[PDB]
Amino acid sequence: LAPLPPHVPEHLVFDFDMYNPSNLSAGVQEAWAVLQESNVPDLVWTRCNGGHWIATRGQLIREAYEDYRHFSSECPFIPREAGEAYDFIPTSMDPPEQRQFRALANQVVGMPVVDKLENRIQELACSLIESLRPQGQCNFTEDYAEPFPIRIFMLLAGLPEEDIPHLKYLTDQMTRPDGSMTFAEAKEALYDYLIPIIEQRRQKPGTDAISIVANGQVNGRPITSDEAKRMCGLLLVGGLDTVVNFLSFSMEFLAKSPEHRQELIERPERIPAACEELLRRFSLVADGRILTSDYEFHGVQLKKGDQILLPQMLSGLDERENAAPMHVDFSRQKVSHTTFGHGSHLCLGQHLARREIIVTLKEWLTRIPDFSIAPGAQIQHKSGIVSGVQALPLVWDPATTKAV
Ligand code: HEM
Ligand SMILES: CN(C)c1cccc2c(S(=O)(=O)NCCCCCCCCNC(=O)[C@]34C[C@H]5C[C@H](C[C@H](C5)C3)C4)cccc12
Ligand SMILES: [K+]
Numbered sequence: 001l002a003p004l005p006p007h008v009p010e011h012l013v014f015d016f017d018m019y020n021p022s023n024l025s026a027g028v029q030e031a032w033a034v035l036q037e038s039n040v041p042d043l044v045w046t047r048c049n050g051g052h053w054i055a056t057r058g059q060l061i062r063e064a065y066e067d068y069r070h071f072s073s074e075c076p077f078i079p080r081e082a083g084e085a086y087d088f089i090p091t092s093m094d095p096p097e098q099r100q101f102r103a104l105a106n107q108v109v110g111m112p113v114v115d116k117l118e119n120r121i122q123e124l125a126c127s128l129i130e131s132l133r134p135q136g137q138c139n140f141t142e143d144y145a146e147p148f149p150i151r152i153f154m155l156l157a158g159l160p161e162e163d164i165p166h167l168k169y170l171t172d173q174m175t176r177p178d179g180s181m182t183f184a185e186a187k188e189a190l191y192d193y194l195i196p197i198i199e200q201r202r203q204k205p206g207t208d209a210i211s212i213v214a215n216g217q218v219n220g221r222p223i224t225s226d227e228a229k230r231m232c233g234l235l236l237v238g239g240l241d242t243v244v245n246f247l248s249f250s251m252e253f254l255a256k257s258p259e260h261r262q263e264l265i266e267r268p269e270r271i272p273a274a275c276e277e278l279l280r281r282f283s284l285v286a287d288g289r290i291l292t293s294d295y296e297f298h299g300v301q302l303k304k305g306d307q308i309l310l311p312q313m314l315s316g317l318d319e320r321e322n323a324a325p326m327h328v329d330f331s332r333q334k335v336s337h338t339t340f341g342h343g344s345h346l347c348l349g350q351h352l353a354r355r356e357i358i359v360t361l362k363e364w365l366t367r368i369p370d371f372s373i374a375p376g377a378q379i380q381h382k383s384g385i386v387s388g389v390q391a392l393p394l395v396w397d398p399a400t401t402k403a404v
Contacts, residue, residue, distance in 0.1 A: 002051035007303050012041055017048040018078060018286060018309060021383050028381040028388075029282065033317050033326070043300050050079045052288070053300075053308035058315035058338065060298060064289060065310060065343035068094045070297070071289035073345065077385060078288060078309055085184040088234035089227060095344045097219065104216040104223070105231060105348050108156065108209040109239075114351045117155065121355055124151055125363045126404070133367055133401050137374065140392035141248045149243040149356060153236060158208025159197075167193065167236070175241045175386070190236075191229055198228050209235060239349050242285065243356055245388030249282035250357070251364075252392055253328065255373045263330060265369050268362065274330040275357045280316035280337035281328050284387040287312070312338050313387065367404050371396040 001015060014035070021031035035044070035056040042057045055061045064071045072094050075083035090098040090105060107113075128147060132138045150168055154161065170193055174186035181189075198214045202225060205211040213235070214228035223231075254261050264274055288309040295302045302308070316337025317325045340347035347353070371394050373379065380390035 001047040002049075004045070004047060005051065005303070005306075007301055008045045008051075012043070012045050012300065014040060014044040014046055014054075015048055016044070016046045016054060018046075018054075018311075019049065019384055024381055024383055028284070028383050029313065029317060030326070031381075031383065032286075032311060032313055032387075035311075035314065036318060043298055050307070052078050053302065053306060055308060055310050056314060058318040058321040058336070061310045061312070061315050061338060062342050064297070064308060065338070065341065065345075068344055070292055070295045070302075071308065071310070072292045073098075073289060075290040075307065076287045078307055080307060082183040083290065083307065085182070085187065087187075087230055088237075089230040091234055091238075091345060092230075098344060100218045101227070101231060102344075102348065104213060104218060105235065107216070108212055108235065109349050109352055111351050113156075114355055117152070117352070118355060118359075120155055121152060121359050122363065124148065125359050126367075129363055129367050130403060133403065134398050136398045137393070137395045140251050140394050141244065141389055142391070144360075145244040145247045145251075145392075148247070148360070149239050152352070152356065153239060156209045157232075157235070158206055158210065171237055171240055175237060187233070190233055194229050194232050194236075195225075198225055198232065202228075238347075239352065241386045241388065243353055245284055245386055246279075246282060246353075247357065247360055248389035248392050249284065250278045250361070251394070252373070252379055252389060253278070253282065254361075254365075255371055255392075255394055257328070260328060260330070261365070261369070261371075264361065264365055268365070270330050271361050271365075272354075272358055273332075273335075275354060275361065276335045277328060277330050277332055278357075279339045280322065280335050281326070283313040283316050283337055283339040285312040285339070285341070285385070286310075286314075286387070287385055312341050315342075363404075368396050368401050370400045 016035060024031045040056055042060055044054050044056060046054060055064055073092060076091060077083035077086055086092055090101040128144050132143055150164055170190045174190055197210060201211045202214050205215045210232055213231050216223050264271055286309060288307060291302050291304050291306045293304045315321055316339060319325055321336045340350040374393035374395045377393045382388045382390055
């Protein structure tokens with residue numbers, strides 16, 4: 001526990017630990033939802049992880065994400081030392097500078113790009129599922145979820161298949177840290193892979209995402225090799241652990257709820273709406289901002305340089321946003337959430353993520369309609385900037401399946 005700064009009133013202190021919440025064994029979302037019990041203020045201070053504010057309700061979370069002038073992305077991670085070394089583009093920049101880097105990134109992951117990849121995503125999901133289907137078991141996280149988005153990235157970025165294991169090792173080193181290296185060391189190792197590929201593609205550009213990025217124009221002039229490197233790093237990692245962990249939460253729920261499975265089996269047209277409801281219920285990202293100046297925010301004095309966690313996860317779990325928030329209903333009329341963020345940094349990959357999810361659910365339920373959590377397995381959750389599932393052992397009877 002970091003000593004309480006003098007400006008923080010005692011009555012706002014709730015020592016929530018975002019990397020190890022108590023009651024984690026009851027499910028991550030549940031463990032974070034304690035921040036929304038009736039005696040917890042809308043805005044609290046925790047002494048864990050260096051000390052930082054947490055906005056606990058959707059209204060404040062949305063408002064802080066809109067107000068980039070007070071709530072800067074310059075240092076977006078807890079703890080402070082990780083936010084400080086983090087330099088990805090555009091996640092470490094504020095508007096107005098961020099605006100055009102965002103425009104460039106959007107050329108590479110936005111809607112028209114997704115509509116063209118739809119089928120390649122489908123062929124990938126199918127071959128992954130078909131290879132598992134006859135075995136009657138998998139670790140979903142390891143055998144389907146992890147191989148999936150890295151392979152879509154390679155397709156986007158025109159990178160060779162043989163690179164996957166190496167790239168996977170580099171990204172895991174950054175995003176699942178075991179404490180053996182600082183974030184800054186993990187970032188440099190990743191940059192060491194990207195640096196030469198950018199050089200090559202600035203000299204000899206093709207039509208992959210890295211060529212488009214490394215040769216784009218920003219705020220009047222050509223992008224620097226440094227800026228391109230910083231963008232490509234985010235393009236790579238931004239779609240990995242979010243998608244892996246999200247698919248894992250989703251499949252865990254479907255494995256545990258035959259009634260919801262059946263609903264989607266009998267009514268496949270509801271899969272896109274079911275995807276949205278799952279995005280809300282199993283929301284999983286929690287980053288934040290640093291105060292650019294002293295600022296009174298909903299009655300609370302915030303001090304220049306204070307960090308604030310603004311959990312994207314919590315908005316849609318908030319009773320004030322969605323009634324009976326822990327309950328899953330695929331026919332919910334107004335599914336509100338900020339699972340992909342809010343304000344100027346609203347996830348550029350959201351459209352690709354939804355096709356990854358929808359395609360996964362469609363293809364899986366079609367080939368393996370009936371599945372369960374392996375007998376005797378207890379599912380372990382992990383908590384962090386991107387919360388997740390440690391392992392997801394699934395079982396099915398292969399006779400209830402069909403090759404398609
Ligand atoms: C379930 C899947 C996903 C979730 C939950 C998610 C979540 C988020 C969130 C919360 C942010 C805002 C971060 C902030 O404001 O600091 C963000 C931004 C971003 N995401 Fe995603 N994301 C997902 C998938 C993807 C994919 C597949 C890509 C493709 C590479 C991607 C690329 C990006 C990029 C480039 C940004 C930065 C936008 C900017 O700063 O202007 N994301 N995402
Ligand atoms: C102070 N002390 C002692 C400490 C205490 C506790 C833990 C510590 C840790 S730690 O081991 O817990 N590490 C926490 C930092 C994790 C960094 C992962 C970021 C990369 C994912 N990137 C994205 O860009 C994105 C950016 C954006 C949000 C999100 C999803 C997408 C979109 C991709 C993330 C390290 C060091 C010190 C620690
Ligand atoms: K920084």
